[PDB]
Amino acid sequence: RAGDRIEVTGTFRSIPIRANSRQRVLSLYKTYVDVVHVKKVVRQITDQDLAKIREVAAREDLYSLLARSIAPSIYELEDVKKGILLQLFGGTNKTFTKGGRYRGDINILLCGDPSTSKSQILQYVHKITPRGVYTSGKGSSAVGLTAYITRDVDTKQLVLESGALVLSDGGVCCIDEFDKMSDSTRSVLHEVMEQQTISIAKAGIITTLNARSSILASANPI
Amino acid sequence: SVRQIKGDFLGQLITVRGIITRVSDVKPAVEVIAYTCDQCGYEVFQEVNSRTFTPL
Amino acid sequence: VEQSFKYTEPTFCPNPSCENRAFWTLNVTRSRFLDWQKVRIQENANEIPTGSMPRTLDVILRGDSVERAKPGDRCKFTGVEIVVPDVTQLGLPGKTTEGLNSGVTGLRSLGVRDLTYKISFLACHVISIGSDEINELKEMVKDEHIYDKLVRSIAPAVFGHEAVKKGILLQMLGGVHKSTVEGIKLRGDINICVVGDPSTSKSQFLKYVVGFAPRSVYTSGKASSAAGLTAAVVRDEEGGDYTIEAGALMLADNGICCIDEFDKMDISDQVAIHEAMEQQTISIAKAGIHATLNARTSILAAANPVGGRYNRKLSLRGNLNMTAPIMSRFDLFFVILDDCNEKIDTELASHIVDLHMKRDEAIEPPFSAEQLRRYIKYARTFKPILTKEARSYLVEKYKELRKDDAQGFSRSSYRITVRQLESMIRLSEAIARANCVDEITPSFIAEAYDLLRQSIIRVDV
Amino acid sequence: PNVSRTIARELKSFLLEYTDETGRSVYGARIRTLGEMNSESLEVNYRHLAESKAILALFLAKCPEEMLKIFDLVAMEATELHYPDYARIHSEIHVRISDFPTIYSLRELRESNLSSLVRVTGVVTRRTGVFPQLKYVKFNCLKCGSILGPFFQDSNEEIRISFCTNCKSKGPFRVNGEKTVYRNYQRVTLQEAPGTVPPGRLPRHREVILLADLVDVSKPGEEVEVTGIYKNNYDGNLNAKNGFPVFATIIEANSIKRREGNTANEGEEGLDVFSWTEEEEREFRKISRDRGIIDKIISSMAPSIYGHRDIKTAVACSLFGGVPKNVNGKHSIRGDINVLLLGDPGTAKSQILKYVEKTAHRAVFATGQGASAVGLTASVRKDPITKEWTLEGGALVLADKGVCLIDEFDKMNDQDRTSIHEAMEQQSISISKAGIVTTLQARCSIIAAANPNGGRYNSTLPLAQNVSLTEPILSRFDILCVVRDLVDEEADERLATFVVDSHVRSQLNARQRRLQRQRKKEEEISPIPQELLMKYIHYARTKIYPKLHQMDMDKVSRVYADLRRESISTGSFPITVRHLESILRIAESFAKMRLSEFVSSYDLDRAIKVVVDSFVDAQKVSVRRQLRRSFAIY
Amino acid sequence: IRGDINVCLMGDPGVAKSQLLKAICKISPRGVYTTGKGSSGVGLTAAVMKDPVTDEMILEGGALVLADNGICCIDEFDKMDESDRTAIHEVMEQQTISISKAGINTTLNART
DNA sequence: GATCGATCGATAAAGTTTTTTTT
DNA sequence: ATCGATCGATC
């Protein structure tokens, strides 16, 4: 895929080019490489790990054992460590056939004293989940999240890329700056709080696509 | 300087100072040629003119 | 026969020894045609690794399969593959090193060129995932207490509140729309709201209806800046300004839209939807010509009180938190009350835990979802007309009613005028449209009179 | 072949020998009338079309265009005996076809529809002008016969050849300049109007090629619907998509009509007949020489609403209009009348404006929020990729009798209201924002739907305390209709027992028996039905001009002077030189409905006693003292 | 863990104090200078822009994608702040100098 | 009838500061 | 200005 650190084991070649598009005339060449091998730099579930965790599951202090494991450097603060692993242990989709469609996902938040590893804990949660998100300082916006029209440099046509809240289909939405966020946005997260979806009203097309999501909020004082 | 090099300075040898900008990359230019017929093996040679040319 | 990917010139085997390949004349008479279209596809959301420019390709629909492919949905296809070049013809003259394989493709028998080959795709068939039952209606129409059977079988996520359960069912069905000739088209529906304290049982109906109703959208109505609730055209893009836009009124054409949170909108849209309420069209002239669009709608609302707790001794004239004439333009409400008793919290606790069980399906709605859904589809195919002379009985009730809410010549302008008389009969036919009776009795309008009146004494102290 | 020669005999009989509905030679009468105006057009009645398709359904939907070419040459002989030597002027006629029982939108076209009759709606976008078309290609060789006769050129195909009947060489074909007449050509492209369409999606495009006597009937922006044929032009060249085995689309037209309204009819009000030839104009005089018509017309105008009388006096007077009386090299005179309603939230004020939109001839309905400060009047749309900054007007240049709803859009009230109160004052206003200094001419009319801040009696104090609209823009109107409803029984039932009966108003003979059912459903008390009453307003406005006298004047002199004097010491809102100008203007409005050109004595005091009472009845508690002055006028 | 602390100054002299700071920045190793105009906050990191007729959509940038482990001396802090004010936090916020455009979602380092 | 030579016709171009509503 | 295609003439 595009956008990774890479190493190639390539041979070398060179091709001619036609100057005029409709003649056989040709003279400053263009080179290109031909790769033979490239290198960057459901899990296969075994049974020794299930046997290993059942020793840990035999230990009654697994709550306390997971209390001490989440902090390699953080001060103790037992109360915040409760819900974080609990939100990471994010329930399941206890869905009925008719009626309901409730999901067991909940939403914790925190605010208070500035820079108490408010970000590094969120960075630490980004470590423990492989497929997740990461919010930015106006990297996404109201119209910059989803619902795109953008005139791309390859074909100058339409492309509908999903927002980060839909992109966490199998993760935890880590999001910040919830006192400096603009009030043009901070209006569609109520829908993903409630109908678990994003309604798109764009010139392209309509779509009630869902978003299997799970959120936490890291606010700031004023 | 380049402000006064307009005249009889074509086909001559002049040093000019300045500031280098817009550096391109290194590309292979052509100076000789060898077409193969895969029958006789006489690789034909020719000189290279300006930036566009034509095979035989 | 068999015109190929570029064969716009059938020039083979004439009958006599005439000038072959000299000309052609594409007859529009005998050469039969077929109809097609060319659309683009895109990859589904639950397969992308990251935002890594999700690539795509293009299809061709050939037979009757045109127009079955509604754009913007999950879809499947047939699966024949193809490759199509087009570079040399009679008319117009035919980055990186794309088409580098094309230099191999040169030297055909006609003129030497650089013919490419790009991958494409052809389809043949589309699909889009995402009796006694007709006699069952004839058995179920011959029941007796289905007006009371249906109201108990609306939503398992709610308990009690038997007043507001009656109203939403009438909103769930439709009324009448046929009206007088050469002029006014009258009302077509009812529009009911309920205000109450947030994080209570008000939010459960809103969850209930948007899956229960046909094509009914839900919108918070907080984005009062760009578009949506407010209708506003888009800027000049790719070949023109003044193009129409979406929003949760136009696609509620015979659809039941639901908007909440009336307090936080601006001071301009409160006449815009007020225009949308009185009759069934809206108008726009923003930097383009006038548009004649008719959003045939029926709204559903739930605003917030002025303090979160409803006072008791006063009226809601203070606690409506909006202006006056939209409330008179509206119907009546039956505001949900609140209390903290020792008994109701305990039974609601037992009411919620078996629901929040993974599987405790011991509660029995006496209907199912879909047999109720097809039942009202039988109910909409009548047109009951008042025929009896209870209109003389009708007129004295309102004439008594108007002398009550006007408590003086200088009393407030919530004077329930002749606007509400239309609702006073168009609900009155719809309740008889529930019990499948094709005419109006004076017995049926007994529940019609007090339904405003028990809720107007909620207004009038 | 040759049997089509007899076809012309087989229909000139079948058309001209008899016209339906008790004879009267209907189609035999409208031929000579459009011969008199010299305008090159005919019609076909649908019921005649229903009867002239029994042997012709397999000659309409099978072959639509070459049937018409042989249908064209019989209409010459259908009028050559009537008007001799009519072919010596303009030498040409071609027919047009009326309505059709299809409802096709733009989406629903397939292969089965082509080379046949079609009918579709839409809206007109960007359009070109008028060019001449060669239409008769006198071909030209160089050395052989250089006159191959005037040809019959087709649509966008460029029908020519290399060599035929002279040689077989590559000598090209040229032109010369003897006796090649020209028809014109105007390629409006069409966009689907966003009316009957499943919304939230895109518009779709077509192309329309007009023809000779059908040029510039449409205006850009206005809604139209077209009836014509379908055609194909496989040019074998397209450059948006790749070249492919495809073919374009060209819709040629035979007729065009204006926007229609209240699409619920079965046999009328979809075809713009508006052709008051014999059964109307011979009739319409005795309906004008009765004694209580102005007491009958305005009572029977808006039938659905019983209400107070004076609004229906005013709103009928508004669309009847006055006269744009020009003058010598000096200042022009406004020829418009601009009412303004004021109503309680719940009376019928939103319906009379809705109903009058249908009964007019042309209209617009820019209402409420979203009315741009410029989009009402003309605006400049920027150029496409190789064009110039052109002028594309919006609402007010299209509408000659337009209807707005300026109630209280207060956030935009300080935006647009500086652009509507000079449509009246400095009438025929146009603008030069970054473009050309021009002046379009729009003699528009304005009605309004004002709305106070709550109840109707929001104060005892004058109307500057009541409405948020200030003085000078408010003074650009003529009259202030105000409503009142406090407490009643017998007047309350007079609406209440009335409106309940309105809800009770919910195959050749049976088509007319339903039409006879259409008579009695509006003739309960029989208040002069609207089948024909709108049909004569269109020449109540474009055929008759009134004048005045001088002996019946100076009674009004003290009327303006004393009432202005009586309202400056008691200043609510003033009257100026323009109120008396409106006094004589609505006076001659009534006399135009007698179809009379004069002004009586009965119409002046009628027109006085509709303005003086409607001014004074909004003052104060002290309206009772002013009514003691009132009968001195009577 | 964080290193490379950042010291800020304030005050309004009439000396045009850029000579008091940036003269050091013009002799210090790997110390690049910027101003208000030109390289904004989106123009601080890298971006994809127009190029000549040769290979377009190259990853042109500002300072922080090329002044890694050096000195970023800035002036005019109230200039182009709609993009600047977020991105200057994103070097003090650890290791998120990235180009999160529609092109790619790759992230480079931050040590200045 | 086929091949070669001569003559005639067709084929190659490029963009990114003022001005509108709008948030 | 150059290249390709078509037509005419000669063998």
Ligand SMILES: Nc1ncnc2c1ncn2[C@@H]1O[C@H](COP(=O)(O)OP(=O)(O)OP(=O)(O)O)[C@@H](O)[C@H]1O
């Ligand atoms: N005098 C009347 N006669 C018959 N019908 C009436 C009368 N007054 C009101 N109605 C009915 O009441 C309905 C409500 O529309 P109404 O005319 O009251 O809107 P409105 O209050 O005029 O709106 P707005 O104040 O925005 O102009 C109408 O459909 C109309 O049929």
